[PDB]
Amino acid sequence: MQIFVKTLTGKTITLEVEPSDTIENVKAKIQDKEGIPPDQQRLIFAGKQLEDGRTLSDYNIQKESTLHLVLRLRGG
Amino acid sequence: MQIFVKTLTGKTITLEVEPSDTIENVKAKIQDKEGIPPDQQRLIFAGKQLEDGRTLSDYNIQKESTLHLVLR
Amino acid sequence: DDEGAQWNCTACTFLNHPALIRCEQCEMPRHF
Numbered sequence: 001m002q003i004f005v006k007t008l009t010g011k012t013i014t015l016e017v018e019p020s021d022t023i024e025n026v027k028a029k030i031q032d033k034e035g036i037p038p039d040q041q042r043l044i045f046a047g048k049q050l051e052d053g054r055t056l057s058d059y060n061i062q063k064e065s066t067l068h069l070v071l072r073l074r075g076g
Numbered sequence: 077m078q079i080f081v082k083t084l085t086g087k088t089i090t091l092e093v094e095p096s097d098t099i100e101n102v103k104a105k106i107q108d109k110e111g112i113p114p115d116q117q118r119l120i121f122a123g124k125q126l127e128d129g130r131t132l133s134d135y136n137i138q139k140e141s142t143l144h145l146v147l148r
Numbered sequence: 149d150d151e152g153a154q155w156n157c158t159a160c161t162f163l164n165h166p167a168l169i170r171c172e173q174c175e176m177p178r179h180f
């Protein structure tokens with residue numbers, strides 16, 4: 001299915017994903033399209049920051065949903 | 077464990093804490109380091125105000141997490 | 149109470165505590 005990722009600069013990225021994909025998987029897809037390392041990515045949906053080890057289905061992220069990408073380096 | 081505490085004025089205070097520290101303990105550490113009385117402190121993480129009797133671990137606060145400090 | 153409701157950031161949609169005037173995630177101001 002298709003989902004979208006919107007950036008702080010207002011641009012829309014289109015991804016192809018499955019409901020069983022993890023948030024970590026989604027960040028890898030963003031790296032593919034945008035060159036941004038997963039450790040620099042935070043994803044927001046329905047007002048919440050998404051956790052790497054959960055799936056899209058866990059968050060009820062269905063087709064044509066829009067996530068928001070914030071660039072912020074993960075802790076060490 | 078290192079955490080950051082960002083104030084409303086843009087300062088990032090760096091604290092040494094343990095995951096088992098209570099919020100009350102964290103406020104005491106902020107008092108020791110910065111001089112702010114604990115009763116004047118409100119701590120916020122992931123959009124929510126943190127409660128005194130809970131621990132950092134209760135809120136899944138870990139290495140290099142950023143909390144926000146608002147003063148009364 | 150004076151502070152009102154949590155606010156969704158215009159820039160990233162994060163749901164913020166009403167005492168914060170910059171987004172916890174992206175640091176953008178609430179108001180502009």
Ligand SMILES: [Zn+2]
Pocket residue numbers: 157158159160161162171172173174175176
């Ligand atoms: Zn934001």
